[PDB]
């Protein structure tokens, strides 16, 4: 899986389009460990400590159904302690601490993860 790093806060969906826009992308897919961790050491210098990714807790009132912005199928995932749930924004963002995937409000301004 490509995936590049760019350090410039926006929101979820400017960093989404930002993909798609400059690159012709999307935000990151994650559907391993393997990936999870070289995405994680690529954000081991980042002062930020959360990025994001394509993911969505998307549903309508409480289906709280995960999607990936990408549209490939959610097999996995790497969840933080006391995560994720009764907390965090209906839009995914990956901890640049351990790696560990958090719930984050999608108006945020952090790094994101440019899959191409
Ligand atoms: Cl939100």
Known sequence: ??????????????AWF????????????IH?????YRIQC???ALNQGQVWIGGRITGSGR??????VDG???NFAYWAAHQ???????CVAL??????????????RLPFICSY
Do not use: E, M
């Not at 899986?1 to 400017?14: A, E, I, K, M």
């Not at 391993?32 to 999870?36: A, L, P």
């Not at 289906?63 to 990936?68: A, E, G, H, P």
């Not at 994720?84 to 209906?90: I, K, T």
């Open 42 to 44: 690529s954000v081991s």
């Open 95 to 108: 901890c640049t601490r351990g790696g560990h995937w958090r719930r984050a409000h999608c108006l945020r």
């Open 63 to 68: 289906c709280r159904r995960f999607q990936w």
């Open 84 to 90: 994720p749930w009764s907390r965090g924004g209906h």
């Open 18 to 29: 930002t993909c798609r826009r400059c690159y012709r992308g999307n935000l990151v897919s």
């Open 1 to 14: 899986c490509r995936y590049l790093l760019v350090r410039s806060l926006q929101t979820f969906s400017q």
């Open 32 to 36: 391993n460990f393997n990936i999870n």
């Open 72 to 74: 490939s199928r959610w």
